[PDB]
Design an enzyme around this catalytic site. Structure first.
Site, PDB file in Angstrom:
ATOM      1  N   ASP A 134       0.798  -1.177   0.000  1.00  0.00           N
ATOM      2  CA  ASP A 134       0.000   0.000   0.000  1.00  0.00           C
ATOM      3  C   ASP A 134       0.847   1.249   0.000  1.00  0.00           C
ATOM      4  O   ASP A 134       2.052   1.232  -0.096  1.00  0.00           O
ATOM      5  CB  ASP A 134      -0.883   0.032   1.242  1.00  0.00           C
ATOM      6  CG  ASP A 134      -2.266   0.554   0.960  1.00  0.00           C
ATOM      7  OD1 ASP A 134      -2.429   1.472   0.130  1.00  0.00           O
ATOM      8  OD2 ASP A 134      -3.205   0.046   1.603  1.00  0.00           O
ATOM      9  N   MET A 192      -4.680  11.544   9.191  1.00  0.00           N
ATOM     10  CA  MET A 192      -5.218  12.084   7.942  1.00  0.00           C
ATOM     11  C   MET A 192      -5.874  13.443   8.172  1.00  0.00           C
ATOM     12  O   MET A 192      -6.864  13.785   7.512  1.00  0.00           O
ATOM     13  CB  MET A 192      -6.247  11.124   7.333  1.00  0.00           C
ATOM     14  CG  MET A 192      -5.640   9.829   6.828  1.00  0.00           C
ATOM     15  SD  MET A 192      -6.819   8.784   5.960  1.00  0.00           S
ATOM     16  CE  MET A 192      -7.411   7.795   7.287  1.00  0.00           C
ATOM     17  N   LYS A 202      -4.176   3.471  -3.122  1.00  0.00           N
ATOM     18  CA  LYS A 202      -4.386   4.851  -3.595  1.00  0.00           C
ATOM     19  C   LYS A 202      -5.710   5.482  -3.116  1.00  0.00           C
ATOM     20  O   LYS A 202      -6.735   5.532  -3.829  1.00  0.00           O
TER      21      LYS A 202
HETATM   22  N1  LIG Z   1       5.211   7.392   9.757  1.00  0.00           N
HETATM   23  C1  LIG Z   1       4.135   8.152   9.932  1.00  0.00           C
HETATM   24  N2  LIG Z   1       4.295   9.413  10.464  1.00  0.00           N
HETATM   25  C2  LIG Z   1       3.188  10.184  10.644  1.00  0.00           C
HETATM   26  N3  LIG Z   1       1.910   9.845  10.338  1.00  0.00           N
HETATM   27  C3  LIG Z   1       1.804   8.597   9.817  1.00  0.00           C
HETATM   28  C4  LIG Z   1       2.850   7.703   9.551  1.00  0.00           C
HETATM   29  N4  LIG Z   1       2.359   6.528   9.006  1.00  0.00           N
HETATM   30  C5  LIG Z   1       1.023   6.709   8.913  1.00  0.00           C
HETATM   31  N5  LIG Z   1       0.653   7.956   9.412  1.00  0.00           N
HETATM   32  C6  LIG Z   1      -0.686   8.527   9.591  1.00  0.00           C
HETATM   33  O1  LIG Z   1      -1.624   7.584   9.092  1.00  0.00           O
HETATM   34  C7  LIG Z   1      -2.452   8.151   8.031  1.00  0.00           C
HETATM   35  C8  LIG Z   1      -2.789   7.074   7.026  1.00  0.00           C
HETATM   36  S1  LIG Z   1      -4.193   6.010   7.588  1.00  0.00           S
HETATM   37  C9  LIG Z   1      -3.276   4.478   7.849  1.00  0.00           C
HETATM   38  C10 LIG Z   1      -2.882   4.316   9.366  1.00  0.00           C
HETATM   39  C11 LIG Z   1      -2.086   3.017   9.719  1.00  0.00           C
HETATM   40  N6  LIG Z   1      -3.076   1.927   9.644  1.00  0.00           N
HETATM   41  C12 LIG Z   1      -1.449   3.052  11.113  1.00  0.00           C
HETATM   42  O2  LIG Z   1      -1.821   2.187  12.021  1.00  0.00           O
HETATM   43  O3  LIG Z   1      -0.554   3.930  11.377  1.00  0.00           O
HETATM   44  C13 LIG Z   1      -1.591   9.339   7.548  1.00  0.00           C
HETATM   45  O4  LIG Z   1      -2.356  10.373   6.913  1.00  0.00           O
HETATM   46  C14 LIG Z   1      -0.945   9.819   8.833  1.00  0.00           C
HETATM   47  O5  LIG Z   1      -1.881  10.625   9.604  1.00  0.00           O
END
Ligand SMILES: Nc1ncnc2c1ncn2[C@@H]1O[C@H](CSCC[C@H](N)C(=O)O)[C@@H](O)[C@H]1O
Ligand SMILES: Nc1ncnc2c1ncn2[C@@H]1O[C@H](CSCC[C@H](N)C(=O)O)[C@@H](O)[C@H]1O
Lengths: 228, 219
Positions: free
Chosen positions: A33, A150, A53
């Protein structure tokens, strides 16, 4: 065959679970993804196909071509990534699925989301819903520690709304872009500052609101005791 | 020396992070908390000291071992920074000039493998504890109406928790799920409405994860 829904962690390859690492090394195919760090992928020697996406149909066709496949998602697959939908879709079309939890980005700032006298619980909410609409923040507005994912593009609206719902306009908040990577950038701001459209932040970012943000700050000066 | 605050994951040694695994295999001393799986500890060849259970004592003890080695590992179940008083431990060490590094882990909150967020059902979730530092009771008000609510350390006080959630305005018909010792060979899952819980009609033993909301009926 079998489909492993694997959490890749926030980015740092060392935050992959042992199970995820072994599956990546062993998988004939890895369907990844968005927000999957190139460092994690470079550990996979099998075929790497980007999926994300209509994503469902692609997962199905590779899962059949092999004994098992790995569907890689950032952080933990079961929170904010529609992992729930992928699981349903795959089960409904006769494909076994085994979820492999991971380090969610909600926990990548290193900050204590819960802390004595400041917060006895926390909440996490998305600034964007499936379909692109706006979240109903009321049920979350007053939790001691609030984490928003997000929520960068809509930070002004989200802040104005949280302020409407009653949060302290002077409340300290922290934005953490690309947590756990070498491009990690922390941006401190008070809620009111975010609502006034003064804070520059780019996605993907972790947005944390609450006094906990401030726990490790030195007393005699604005110094991050834990960063140093 | 330096203190690594490490998340042991929910129990399955395979859910340790690569970093946690590396530190555990090399640490001259591992100061482990309670609810850290026996299989995780068996991986550490170093001196293992149970350190948990008042909190000031644990601090004094952590500080002692930290000063006697280049580095030590402070091992906590799940992720070290949620519901484990990890913040207080890190704060104490920093104030005493002990370098600290936090290593995240797979929190038990995510050990059920169920979607805490799901289209049309829940756009976010909340996590709270049924026991505060000191043993007191939680003000559930701020969490009463979140679509998906996850309760930790809520087994013993479940009946009370259920009632408060009901008085706070949550639906009696709401489906919930209890997952005992998730990610272990003795995992066991118990279904039940918020109603049956408030009525003492449900039997669950700790440690358990308590998930409340429609996502519970997604699978
Ligand atoms: N390394 C990272 N640093 C900051 N925000 C992150 C990140 N990886 C994912 N995100 C956050 O996750 C959002 C995608 S939604 C997917 C979230 C993932 N399932 C989890 O458990 O982290 C992004 O817009 C951001 O807000
Ligand atoms: N294997 C497991 N199965 C179910 N609940 C678990 C668990 N391990 C820890 N817990 C939950 O965690 C509580 C201890 S508080 C420590 C939580 C840990 N920091 C984490 O991130 O998971 C227990 O009362 C129980 O509710």
């Amino acid at each position: 065959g079998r489909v492993y829904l694997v959490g890749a962690g926030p980015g740092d390859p060392e935050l992959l679970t042992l199970k995820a690492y072994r599956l990546l090394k062993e998988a004939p195919v890895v369907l990844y993804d968005r927000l999957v760090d190139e460092r994690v992928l470079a550990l996979a020697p099998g075929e790497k196909v980007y999926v994300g996406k209509e994503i469902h149909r692609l997962l199905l066709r590779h899962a059949r071509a092999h004994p098992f496949v790995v569907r890689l998602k950032g952080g933990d697959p079961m929170v904010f990534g529609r992992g729930g939908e992928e699981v349903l879709f795959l089960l409904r079309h006769g494909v076994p699925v085994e979820v492999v939890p991971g380090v969610t980005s909600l926990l990548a700032s290193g900050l204590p989301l819960t802390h004595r006298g400041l917060a006895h619980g926390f909440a996490a909410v998305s600034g964007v819903l499936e379909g692109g609409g706006y979240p109903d923040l009321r049920p979350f507005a007053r939790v001691p520690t609030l984490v928003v994912l997000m929520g960068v593009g809509r930070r002004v609206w989200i802040a104005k709304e949280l302020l409407r719902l009653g949060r302290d306009p002077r409340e300290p908040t922290l934005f953490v872009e690309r947590a756990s990577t070498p491009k990690e950038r922390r941006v401190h701001a008070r809620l009111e500052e975010v609502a006034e459209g003064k804070v520059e932040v780019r996605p993907p970012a972790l947005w944390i609101l609450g006094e906990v943000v401030r726990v490790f700050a030195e007393k005699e000066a604005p110094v991050d005791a834990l960063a140093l």
